[PDB]
């Protein structure tokens, strides 16, 4: 499903192949601890952050992201509670975006974990909190969306008509809203909210400019590309253009910025990684331009060029198809393509 | 009621004096821009909606700005607009400035073509307004969460708290349906409508991500609820975001209009088209500074809950449960602004009520 970074050697990993063991922490900067939780997908882990802090005279910790709601991840959090918090409480929970591996356990943490050790506030952007609430409170519409984009396998379309709430079983009933540019004081640092678009409604990245640390969430990952998909809720969305524009926010940061990604390892070379991501989507866009210059193309037609050797499952094709529509929509909305609905009800794109 | 009337209204210019379109009729306020006025059954008895002459993909028609609540009266007048005042051309799309029921309630009914299913068109909206409306349509001024929120801000009247719990369906009755898809508007986006390029100008504090539309070349501003000539814009703190700072957000958002050309024709959602956008911003700022000062003074005397500020902020007024809801939320907005800035200290008393006193 993901696109792997073959130019990883152009990045430098300041801790080489060190990984915190499940249930342990590793200090990546003074008062900034790295946690790694297991996930049962092809992406087998998420990195979470523990930040030493003091709010209103109470010493403690600010958590960044939560994990999915699994028994494994709950157990590792309790180990961390017992052993690696210096006996201090969590003071608040910051969540970068609504996706289940970042948000699933936000309510459990806010309610103090299995032993209800504290009661603290969720911090989140409005778009991520609203969308997660909506998704945690939720079909045929998705099947028709993909049908117009070339998914004609009758078995596949029927399966789609017939997951989030299991991983995000509960949502905090209140939140404190973060917005772009907000200053969040955490321990000795001023972290600045840096909003990102295209991947999710209103992704919150945190930048500590004085010492050059970036909690990049899923917007800048060293080993994989960031998913951008067009879904049925917003069928004319331009997430790829939104994503490429949001990347400009990191291109200007200091070259030695320590990037703390949600997947992969802490790395330096944020400007180098942005250049790789731009090249990748420009190469992927060019493949679409070429294909649409021969004959009109649907998203299902685009998938085998964009994603060579998928052998993909039904769930996998959902994100592959959504990414093709993202690339087709960028060129369509930019005037490089013309979109037409064929007699079979499928949407196709051709060069202008 | 709960709105603050503009005593300096004479400093604004109304290019159409006291002209008002009749219900079911339109009045042209600028080339290709028609004004509709719908009735509402509140103390605010109307909302202005906008019809913009347009052409998308070669099909001539109309882009609608805002919808009305879903009342029988408002549906009837819309059907009259379709039959008589559209030149027999279809609606092409519906733009909604924010999620509030009088702007959003009939968006789905409009998009699906009204009672006669005359067309099928796309909703245009900011992500924050669309998500929040969907959530509330599935609220701010009703439900057990709202009653507990206002109870800790000083509302003790047993009947009012009972009335608040039963308004669990206050929002869903006015917005009975919501469109299942949307086209996202963002700050700075250019929307080509007819002969104009309108720019999205986002505003905060009143609602999640309020969309105003600015046509810079000819000086037209569809201000939604952010700039109203006769009343202030409501800023409320609700249960979902209890430490919110909507007044700071609102006062900051007003800068986007403060710099606009002085000759700007403002098309507000309540009141009449006017000129004097800069003057009205100056009025609103002076107004919010005077209310903030009243709160500072009161909180220097004794600890004050929001319920204690309401009789000060809204002098000698008889408020029903709907009115008291927004009055209470605005008092919390003013208290929160001062608290978060460090001028006040917030403490919860043994009765569970939050009270504010000046920082010493
Ligand atoms: Ca938003
Ligand atoms: Cl757009
Ligand atoms: Zn993600
Ligand atoms: Zn992720
Ligand atoms: Zn409103
Ligand atoms: Zn309104």
UniProtKB/TrEMBL annotation, chain A:
Domain of life (superkingdom): Bacteria
Keyword Metal-binding attached: yes
Residue stretches making up the Metallo-beta-lactamase domain: 45-263
Xref: InterPro entries: B_lactamase-like_C, Metallo-B-lactamas, RibonucZ/Hydroxyglut_hydro, Sec-metab_biosynth-thioest, WH-like_DNA-bd_sf
UniProt KW keywords: Hydrolase, Metal-binding, Zinc
Binding site for Zn(2+) 2: 101-102, 218, 263
Pfam families to which the protein is assigned, alphabetical: B_lactamase-like_C, Lactamase_B
Molecular function via GO: hydrolase activity; metal ion binding
The keyword Zinc appears for this protein: yes
Binding-site list for Zn(2+) 1: 97, 99, 199, 218
PANTHER family in the record: ENDORIBONUCLEASE LACTB2, METALLO-BETA-LACTAMASE SUPERFAMILY POTEIN
Identification of the protein by name: Zn-dependent hydrolase
Organism of derivation: Burkholderia multivorans (strain ATCC 17616 / 249)
Lineage: Bacteria, Pseudomonadati, Pseudomonadota, Betaproteobacteria, Burkholderiales
């Amino acid at each position: 499903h993901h696109h792997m970074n073959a130019l990883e050697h152009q990045l430098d990993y300041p801790f080489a192949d060190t990984l915190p063991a499940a249930g342990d922490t590793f200090e990546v900067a003074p008062g900034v601890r790295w946690l790694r939780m297991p996930l049962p997908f092809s992406l087998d882990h998420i990195n979470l952050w523990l930040l030493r802090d003091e709010i209103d005279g109470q010493a403690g910790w600010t958590v960044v992201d939560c994990g999915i709601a699994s028994d494994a991840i709950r157990t590792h959090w309790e180990q961390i509670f017992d052993a690696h918090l210096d006996g201090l409480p969590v003071l608040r929970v910051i969540v970068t975006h609504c996706h289940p591996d970042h948000f699933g356990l936000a309510n459990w943490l806010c309610e103090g974990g299995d032993k209800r050790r504290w009661n603290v506030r969720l911090w989140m952007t409005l778009g991520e909190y609203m969308f997660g609430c909506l998704m945690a409170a939720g079909g045929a519409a998705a099947a028709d969306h993909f049908a117009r984009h070339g998914l004609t396998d009758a078995a596949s379309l029927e399966k789609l008509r017939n997951y989030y709430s299991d991983l995000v079983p509960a949502v905090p009933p209140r939140y404190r809203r973060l917005r772009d540019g907000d200053a969040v004081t955490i321990g000795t640092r001023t972290w600045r909210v840096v909003t990102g678009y295209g991947h999710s409604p209103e992704h919150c990245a945190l930048h500590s400019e004085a010492d050059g640390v970036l909690i990049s969430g899923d917007m800048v990952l060293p080993r994989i590309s960031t998913n951008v998909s067009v879904f049925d809720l917003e069928p004319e969305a331009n997430p790829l253009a939104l994503y490429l524009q949001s990347l400009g926010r990191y291109e200007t940061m200091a070259p030695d910025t320590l990037v703390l990604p949600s997947h992969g390892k802490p790395f330096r070379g944020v400007r180098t990684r942005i250049a790789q991501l731009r090249a990748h989507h420009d190469a992927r866009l060019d493949e679409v331009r070429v294909a649409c210059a021969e004959q009109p193309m649907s998203a299902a037609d685009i998938v085998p060029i964009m994603f060579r050797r998928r052998e993909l499952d039904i769930h996998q094709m959902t994100f592959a198809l959504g990414e093709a529509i993202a690339h087709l929509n960028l060129l369509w909305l930019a005037g490089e393509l013309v979109r037409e609905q064929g007699d079979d009800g499928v949407l196709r794109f051709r060069i202008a």
